[PDB]
């Protein structure tokens, strides 16, 4: 990890400090260099802790004249890379390119340094431990460091551009995998200017992503619009408004299994949703949502509401009979019990319940047929953790389907206790109707606001709350176990004391007071303390901290609902059949444009 | 719609691409133009998909020399417009004017192009599908695009300014129907500078609106104050304060049926209320509200409060008698029932109730006589949807009058059940007293703030709330239908379970707890879940989201109450008689100013 890298760095600094030739290369001592290179017994192949040569130290500290004296002493040090674990293929050319001095790169290419040297060390891998990802080839280093003359010299001296490093990235991918600066689009245009004699824009990496798809995934927009200038054609500019034509070949992705918009909306990066407001993409998903997405989403919302009404109606008319066993017991109220399966289906109302229960089971199966495959098609942590694709609603729909299948199992085999899976399933499936609230502007941001407070402030409230419930429940059970439970039974034993002080933490039930008896005085004292520190502060500070959170994350939920309606549109196609979803855009084969689909917009500027 | 316009645009691009003369006119190929126009067999009358000539393509891509070679080949193409549906009357002069090149307009007016060419196509209509509304005549195009030399050349070569297009708009209306730029007032002054030989400022469009009234409706203020510089006269400027005199002929609109201020306050545009703060209008409506509006509004508020007190007093002393039928039933409490009409009016207190009920019916009739006509005079969606004119208060006053007329019907005919219209009417008519709260500064913005939360955050809360009521009501009825209903009857059957968990969603009633019996444990578990996710988050997140909404829309309600007091002042005149409302302003006939009414203000500058 980082301590190993620190140990490697102090070891290589110690190895440069110990060796006099490496010390003279580091400190640019010219007279000591003439003494050392004049002596023929000096080892020209001295290596550091990482196997670095003297040119690596001479280029690391940007010593031009020490490096040129080293090539005069030993040209064959130019071919030699490093040989240890954090720097497996690092040459002096990588360091000379990365330090941005042109004359040293001219010095190494004058003596024939390797231009296709794949620096496959662990320091150059795309890792969170490494600060930057500059690729492995010196062409990728020169493209990422932002020197046009160095990359022009490298292409003039070789540097085959179609070179894939570890993770399969070419130089356009690694230029996209950068913090956005001024010269990144200029370097992209310069590297595609040298593409002239399957192009550079169509080769994928090891994830199967084109540079257009990688720019869609990683969330950069200034590279995305620079890419889309080259894929657009301005039709006319009559007056203030102009009509222009965008190509949706690499945006819609009709024929491919993995599409561009699905890679955008199912991304861990926050900025990828900012691609959904870009100048082809916003009106493409707006057309796809207003004509096709919202009516089909309303149809499936109405069908899910009717199915939930059917399951509720089958729940309420449950087969119950009189209790054959006698009670003969105070504190025991049970007058009805579950029917066995033999007399559960004997009447016409029981037959209506049977066909409704078969409808409920058929609905559970058709839930499980179209939702179990994309547990496995996309990642399961990606499927459940994303609030854009509807993760928590997916896991409670899966839980509801499993619970009603367990209800089927406990109905087919005579097992008492159908109350508890019907209770969990009938809470969860009805609370899963809020998944269909994302298709409406008034209901969507409120629903993801409720999700952001379930996964946010309510967890940190309920931890300290449950601390307060445990302490005051225990104190209330101490103060009331010397007491008659028939006069005040809120704290009769410890589970109902826990549940009771959880009940009056929120002030749902009243304070326990009986004025016909004499309560203990320290019930009054620790209940006054419970009134002060628990239901006066915490129940009001929860409202305050929600009000403080709401204005901060209101812009985030307002920009995330418009990202999750795109995920709803992307989900709705490829699952509904293709005859219900015609291909979006204008077909260019009818107008002789060469089998491409286009989208046309008017924009009114000035 | 937009797909038809896209199909038309790709069709005309295909037609320009296929035809070689149109292709050479588009790409300015001069040598191919000399080849084509040198050949006499080439069709000079070639038309595109929209019937566009070669001059339309030559002016669309701003090709001057291609256009002049086309007039050298064919002058008669200058007279020819288009002939299809989206461009019915578009000539090359409209495109040449809209592209803002003067020499091409000089070229077409050198060969005698039609200056009064009415471009009556669907692309030039004022529609939400079209991005801009530049009118139909080339004079309107030159006025809206902002070229003084082009509109001067058009007036020098004809261009009768009193020309009305579809919707009846002249060039001043279409200049007003613009986003506000710098040169709009300059173009207005230039076009009224050419009005010298019923003027341009007095001609109406097809809605009956003058350009002053259209500027009042559409919400532009920089055009409005530029209009009011020409209708004002500065009396004196002694010292820092100056006294000036504004003319209220076109502002007050005494003689006309539709007035200016009513068109301002009953407008769909948001910016029209910003005309109510302008330098004649604010002090005009302030004088009209402070001297006449507020005392008459307080008189009608006191009369409505006394009428509501009379209806309440007639409600409370309702004729009730002892029940002739015996109860003989547990769970049935009814000891009084409605009297029949024969013994309802027999005593002196019944006679006082009879004259009070006649006062109530007379009040309902005089509500319906002055409120049913302006359901139809203005639009009904305009009357009910506007929060400025008092829409929801109008619909609940109409509902209260209909319900008390239904009470009169169900009293005159012996029909049991006067409870249902008296309950709805006595809620609604008392809640309609807040319509008179708009006349006070302390109560007005609060009243429209309550309206903004009725139509705002409470709908989106109550949808997901009713989802929670349905799910937890159904789960509570599962957990308590195996139970004795005499021990805990909140969830005895499904309607009272729905009403009960709606009652303790809000924590009005206590939690159902009986410590002398053993409640089910899954009642405790799903009630702990109902305590966590429904009355701890939602009832606190609702206060949080009102606190987030309030500071955002506080400026909007503060600027909208001062717009709705103007609508109250406009409503109060024309309904109260003319002897109670003298004409506002200073009469110029007494001082010999020529039968106009004026308003005088001092303003203190520097």
Brief description of this entry?
The structure is cut from a larger assembly and holds two copies of chain A (606 residues). Chain A is built from 26 helices and six strands.
Q: In total, how many beta strands of chain A?
A: 6
- Strand percentage of chain A lies at under 5%
For the biggest β-sheet of chain A, the strand order reads 1-2-6-5
Number of helical stretches of at least 4 residues of chain A: 26
Over all CA atoms, what is the radius of gyration of chain A? Answer: 35 Å
Oligomer: part of a larger assembly
Distance between the termini of chain A: 55 Å
The number of distinct structural domains of chain A comes to 2
Catalytic activity (chains A, B): Ca(2+)(in) = Ca(2+)(out)
Protein name (chains A, B): Transient receptor potential cation channel subfamily V member 5
Family (chains A, B): Belongs to the transient receptor (TC 1.A.4) family. TrpV subfamily. TRPV5 sub-subfamily.
ANK repeats (chains A, B): 16-46, 50-79, 88-117, 134-163, 167-197, 207-236
Q: Keyphrases for this structure?
A:
part of a larger assembly; 2 chains; 606 residues; mainly alpha; four-stranded antiparallel β-sheet; two-stranded antiparallel ribbon; 26 helices; 53% helix; transport protein; Ion channel; Kidney; Transient receptor potential cation channel subfamily V member 5
